[PDB]
Scaffold this active site. Structure first.
Site, short mmCIF file in Angstrom:
data_model
loop_
_atom_site.label_atom_id
_atom_site.label_comp_id
_atom_site.label_asym_id
_atom_site.label_seq_id
_atom_site.Cartn_x
_atom_site.Cartn_y
_atom_site.Cartn_z
N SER A 9 0.82 -1.20 0.00
CA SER A 9 0.00 0.00 0.00
C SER A 9 0.86 1.26 0.00
O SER A 9 2.03 1.26 0.42
CB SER A 9 -0.92 0.02 1.22
OG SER A 9 -1.80 -1.09 1.23
N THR A 44 -6.59 3.59 7.20
CA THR A 44 -8.01 3.54 7.57
C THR A 44 -8.25 3.66 9.06
O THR A 44 -9.41 3.60 9.48
CB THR A 44 -8.63 2.24 7.05
OG1 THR A 44 -7.92 1.12 7.58
CG2 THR A 44 -8.58 2.20 5.53
N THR A 140 6.41 -13.87 8.51
CA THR A 140 6.39 -13.16 9.78
C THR A 140 4.98 -13.11 10.35
O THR A 140 4.47 -12.02 10.66
CB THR A 140 6.94 -11.74 9.62
OG1 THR A 140 6.15 -11.05 8.64
CG2 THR A 140 8.38 -11.77 9.17
N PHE A 144 -1.94 -15.63 15.95
CA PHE A 144 -3.24 -15.97 15.41
C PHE A 144 -3.14 -16.40 13.95
O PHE A 144 -3.83 -17.33 13.52
CB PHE A 144 -4.20 -14.79 15.54
CG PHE A 144 -5.59 -15.08 15.06
CD1 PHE A 144 -6.31 -16.13 15.59
CD2 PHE A 144 -6.17 -14.31 14.06
CE1 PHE A 144 -7.59 -16.41 15.15
CE2 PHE A 144 -7.45 -14.58 13.61
CZ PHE A 144 -8.16 -15.64 14.16
N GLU A 145 -2.28 -15.74 13.18
CA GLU A 145 -2.10 -16.13 11.78
C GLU A 145 -1.41 -17.48 11.67
O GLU A 145 -1.72 -18.27 10.77
CB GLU A 145 -1.33 -15.04 11.04
CG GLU A 145 -2.12 -13.74 10.90
CD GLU A 145 -1.24 -12.53 10.66
OE1 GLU A 145 0.00 -12.66 10.72
OE2 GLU A 145 -1.79 -11.43 10.40
N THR A 178 5.92 -13.04 15.38
CA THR A 178 6.31 -11.79 15.93
C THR A 178 5.56 -11.38 17.14
O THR A 178 6.02 -10.59 17.87
CB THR A 178 6.13 -10.71 14.88
OG1 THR A 178 4.75 -10.47 14.65
CG2 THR A 178 6.72 -11.14 13.63
N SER A 179 4.38 -11.92 17.33
CA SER A 179 3.62 -11.58 18.48
C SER A 179 2.88 -12.77 18.98
O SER A 179 2.47 -13.56 18.22
CB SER A 179 2.68 -10.46 18.14
OG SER A 179 1.51 -10.51 18.89
N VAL A 218 4.83 -1.78 23.88
CA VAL A 218 4.40 -0.39 23.76
C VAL A 218 2.88 -0.40 23.73
O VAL A 218 2.27 -1.00 22.84
CB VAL A 218 4.99 0.28 22.51
CG1 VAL A 218 6.50 0.37 22.61
CG2 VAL A 218 4.58 -0.46 21.25
N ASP A 227 4.93 -4.22 8.47
CA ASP A 227 5.64 -3.93 7.23
C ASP A 227 7.08 -3.54 7.50
O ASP A 227 8.01 -4.09 6.89
CB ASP A 227 4.90 -2.82 6.48
CG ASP A 227 3.39 -3.04 6.46
OD1 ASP A 227 2.97 -4.21 6.42
OD2 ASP A 227 2.64 -2.04 6.50
#
Lengths: 304, 308
Positions: A9, A44, A140, A144-145, A178-179, A218, A227
């Site tokens: 994007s 958005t 990455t 959940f993904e 990553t999370s 954070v 990204d």
């Protein structure tokens, strides 16, 4: 020396997609060809947004323009958030063609689908599962993904690394969650990130290097973090192809510097005790240039 | 702290328009909001190019999206190549509105229209000359025309440095307080291998009077066709005049030295890619900008201007 095709994007104001990926990669020494998958005034998360979306056919046109000039030659391909199945399929076709041209091409893919709730059209989960991830070399995903792609829920670090082994089996030799919601020794405010790299020895034997990372959270909503993370991980794994420990330490440290500076400047721009707006929380990308070029190591990965 | 609204072309590969302007500006410490006036695979100097152009109404929609979020706030406006009269008129409307909101806003405009063939030729629709003359240039603060564009805007042909500076005075009269003729047919002291560039800046005095600082510069001519040079030049001139607001000499010296470093590295690498004695292709002549990062950050001064 090293050229990356980033198809992401674009926003007039802000740092998401290519805006969050091209500049760091450029300052880290990578030539970047950027296909702006969309052009919006802003992301958005703002109260309002206006813009246009590039069609899949239009993406094809741009790729064919590069191709007919014989400049569709890349060392890397980088992608992230996509909302249209057609667009992602066309990206997969481009990746397959490029890898047929260059067998050592590395496809870095952030399989953006959801978090914690899936904020992408559901028809993209199969596409990411059966078409995108198989041709990816570095992915990455968040926890959940990883669960969505594997089909299995993760309740433990052992289960997390079993899911990451399944993902390795699906294609990518490097998998970074990553999370995650995994518990941390340091406290509830540290998030757990896991890394797994399949290293092919000259022996022909393959060994899986596994790493654990914990980072202070954070507590603010940022856009474009995935990204930036994928872009800088591309860079640092390129510099450390068989030392995911150092690559991830540097990526996470640069991310920490960027987010620290961003939250500082956002709280400054807003009032004390006031919640920074989405406009105020834009990643302070340019002002972190130096920290991105050579990040001070503020996180250490644990080899398992 | 300093945000530039750059409304220019975007290329997937290469460095023209925003691609040639955002990265240096970003590396020089400037925030940049970029409206990609087009998305092409590459610049039109290649044998082929594919893509789409942003419609004028689409530019309006993007600007209105910024506006309704109250993020239409800019210290600079930067434009260059535009081929559509409607697009330019919309740019003028945007600039007028922003200048109503910010009286200090600096509109940097490269009035791209044409160049010379060692006689002059325009590479934009003729309908743009009036718009640039009567609409764009009047609201611009810094213009970087070549000699041909200065002659077109002034209606006078330039035959001498004296006439060049009289035309630059006419351009000042039309609006912009800073006028740089980046390229000219004027004779150089060193011979035909050096090119002449001129600079003129109207300074308001503490008395309230206005005096024009004038400078002359000579650059080694590079024997190759480069695209995006005007865009990179305008961007770095914006940056360096922002750092040197009352010293056009130093700003132009830094800008031209950075240009020289980028062009030297680019031609060297292009000759490397190509064979010895072989003409580099447009693809091989793309500005080696990433590799020139540091030279853009703090260029070695290799050119010296003469104040007149």
């Amino acid at each position: 020396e090293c050229r990356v095709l980033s198809i992401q994007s674009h926003v007039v104001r802000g740092y998401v997609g290519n805006r969050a990926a091209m500049f760091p990669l450029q300052v880290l020494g990578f030539e970047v060809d950027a296909v702006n998958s969309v052009q919006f005034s802003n992301h958005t998360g703002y109260a309002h947004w206006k813009g246009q979306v590039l069609k899949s056919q239009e993406l094809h046109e741009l790729y064919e323009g590069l191709k007919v000039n014989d400049v569709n030659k890349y060392d890397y391909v980088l992608t992230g958030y996509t909302r249209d199945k057609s667009f992602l399929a066309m990206v997969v076709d481009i990746v397959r063609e490029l890898k047929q041209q260059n067998s050592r091409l590395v496809y870095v893919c952030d399989p953006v689908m959801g978090d914690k709730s899936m904020y992408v059209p559901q028809d993209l989960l199969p596409v990411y599962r059966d078409k995108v991830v198989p041709v990816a070399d570095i992915i990455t995903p968040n926890q959940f993904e990883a669960e969505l792609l594997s089909g299995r829920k993760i309740h433990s670090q052992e289960e997390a690394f079993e899911v990451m082994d399944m993902l390795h089996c699906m294609g990518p030799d490097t998998v970074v969650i990553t999370s995650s919601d995994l518990p941390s020794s340091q406290g509830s405010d540290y998030l757990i990130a896991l890394g797994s790299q399949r290293m092919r020895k000259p022996d022909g034997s393959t060994v899986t290097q596994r790493i654990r990372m914990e980072m202070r959270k954070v507590e603010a909503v940022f856009v474009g973090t995935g990204d930036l993370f994928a872009a800088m991980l591309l860079a640092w794994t390129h510099k450390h192809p068989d030392n995911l420990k150092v690559a991830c330490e540097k990526t996470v440290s640069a991310m920490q510097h960027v987010l620290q500076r961003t939250i500082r400047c956002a709280k400054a721009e807003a009032g004390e005790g006031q919640k920074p707006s989405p406009a105020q929380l834009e990643l302070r990308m340019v002002q972190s240039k130096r920290d991105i070029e050579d990040p001070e190591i503020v996180v250490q990965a644990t080899v398992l």
